[PDB]
Subunit: 341 residues, 2 copies
């Protein structure tokens, strides 16, 4: 790359010699490294030795929230914030009230709609506006959140399985909840994947394999990991069971793999709004400096060959949560649409 | 820089060998160049040969807007596009005469005056703005590529305060301030209010000459630079308007030259500044041509106030904070601002 190397050192020299402020070579190369890695996609980046030490503590694909909780007291106030935590260092304190999360007012939202904004993949970012501070604050979802499928039997005999994240036991837990509620009365199963940031790819593949006897569930394009293709397997465990999937703009990664597999094999009717559009596998690359690189090494592809990253999954029938409609009413109306198939 | 060069080539190798997509050396170094130059500040960047050819067409510090106009002609609060010429950049993007613009930089035009709309539409030439049309569900990025000719807009208020609206500092601004103040001087004139709201700047020299009209001594502005050297512009003797009381009105869009003028008049206690903190833009940029035909736009100097305060990133705090209250009529705000100026010793 002699022609490119020559252009780079020429520019480096002009920057070092004419920028208003004299910068160190260590600072200039660090700016060059950030552009080299972050210029690949919106998820690849350089990690400082500390950002790396912090990221190794978390398991990849865990559901997480902030290092505190919000509770309504006549106003969503901060509570359980531990002294010395990253949020404490940024200025947050127990008692302060949060008015917005990612420009969305918490007035009129339920405890669930607030968790919907607070929850996300571990390591992810969110902004908060406090009534005290006059400016927004960037926080990191660094607190792992344990979850189980949340089942609800609707009056119309539709079993709703709320999956906030795919975990090692998700597939076995879907099997158990459907069977424990299965009978001549069960009409259909509605899988609520709204606000599901993903979780384990293997769990989404196993979950889809419960309802598919053949065909590719998902394919991966990778140079360092190789081009894999996960195929479904025979087993009429769930053949006569009608299935629906509910997604929102926060449904992502593994949740999109599962949704796409079920939709493109026409096994489930997908309702809601277009998914987030995140279909990447990242790997951490330690450096001698102690720092590291977080980089995309694989892209997920749907059975029809569609790239999930940047596109997202379009539902079979668009029906987002209408403005200020009550949650349990939206669930019932979504269940009604599924029964009319 | 052996330790940092070794780290850079190691990272380059990891990217080239493991990124999901095989990328060319030309593309990897280009991403490294963009991070190296854009990583300096929010105004420095690499320009492709085309981005450079486009930038040289515009004159530095000219006031500009989009290649069309907005006027409500359908409904009273729906701003429709008019004067859009076929073949223009906006026409190629999908905009058409008749379409309605609901937002500019996420701000609804619904309840705004013709002035508040120009406030969002106007800006330094080459600048960017986003627009949401009623016909589209997604935003559109436009460039202020149409220069806007201007003159000082004078208004004599009933309280005998002369308001001089300066949308941008130009070569004739100083002479025009002198002429408008003199042709309106009399035993009745109480004070002069310089309205610099939404003024993106213009020529530094024009702001310095404008401040020199009201100052007999002291530094108007200083420049800190390695490639240009540390210069400092001083005021000169000549009591042009010794007995003239002066006020300055600024908003969050008042910037660069407008901030230099405002800071000079404020820190020498020559004018009472009201409104809200200025934008905070005090940089001098230089273009660095490259053999590829491309170039680098980079900050080479910072402007400093008389007290030695840096304008870039700080902005100028007014003497008395008084932003346009919610839904207050413009003429009323101007009268209240003029009243505050008259209540000064
Ligand atoms: Cl080579
Ligand atoms: Cl060195
Ligand atoms: Cl020119
Ligand atoms: Na199967
Ligand atoms: Na003078």
């Amino acid at each position: 790359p002699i022609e490119s190397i020559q252009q780079f050192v020429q520019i480096y020299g002009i920057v070092r010699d004419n920028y208003v402020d004299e910068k160190s070579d260590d600072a200039l190369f660090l700016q060059a490294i950030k552009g080299l890695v972050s210029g690949l996609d919106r998820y690849s980046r350089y990690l400082s030795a500390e950002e790396y030490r912090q990221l190794i503590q978390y398991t990849e694909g865990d559901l997480a929230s902030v290092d505190f909780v919000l509770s309504p007291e006549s106003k969503w106030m901060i509570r359980d914030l531990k002294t010395g935590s990253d949020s404490y260092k940024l200025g947050l304190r127990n008692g302060q009230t949060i008015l917005k999360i990612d420009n969305q007012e918490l007035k009129n939202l339920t405890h669930d709609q607030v968790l919907g904004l607070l929850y996300g993949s571990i390591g992810s970012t969110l902004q908060v506006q406090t009534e005290e501070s006059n400016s927004p604050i960037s926080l990191v979802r660094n607190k792992k959140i344990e979850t189980d499928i949340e089942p609800v039997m609707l009056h119309n005999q539709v079993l709703v399985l709320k999956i906030r994240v795919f975990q090692q036991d998700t597939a076995n837990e879907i099997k158990r909840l459907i069977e424990e509620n299965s009978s001549s009365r069960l009409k259909a199963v509605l899988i609520d994947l709204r606000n599901n940031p993903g979780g384990l790819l293997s769990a989404a593949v196993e979950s889809a394999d419960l309802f598919l006897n053949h065909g590719i569930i998902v394919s991966t394009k990778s140079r360092s990991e190789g081009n894999q293709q996960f195929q479904a397997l025979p087993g009429n465990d769930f053949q006569n069971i009608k299935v629906g999937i509910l997604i929102n703009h926060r449904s992502a990664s593994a949740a999109e793999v599962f949704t796409a597999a079920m939709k493109e094999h026409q096994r489930a009717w997908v309702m809601g709004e277009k998914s987030y559009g995140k279909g990447v596998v990242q790997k951490l690359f330690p450096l001698p400096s102690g720092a590291a690189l977080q980089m995309t090494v694989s892209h997920y592809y749907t059975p029809n060959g569609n790239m999930i990253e940047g596109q997202g999954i379009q539902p079979n029938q668009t029906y987002p949560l209408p403005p200020e409609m009550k949650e349990e009413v939206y669930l019932d109306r979504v269940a009604d649409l599924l029964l009319k198939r």
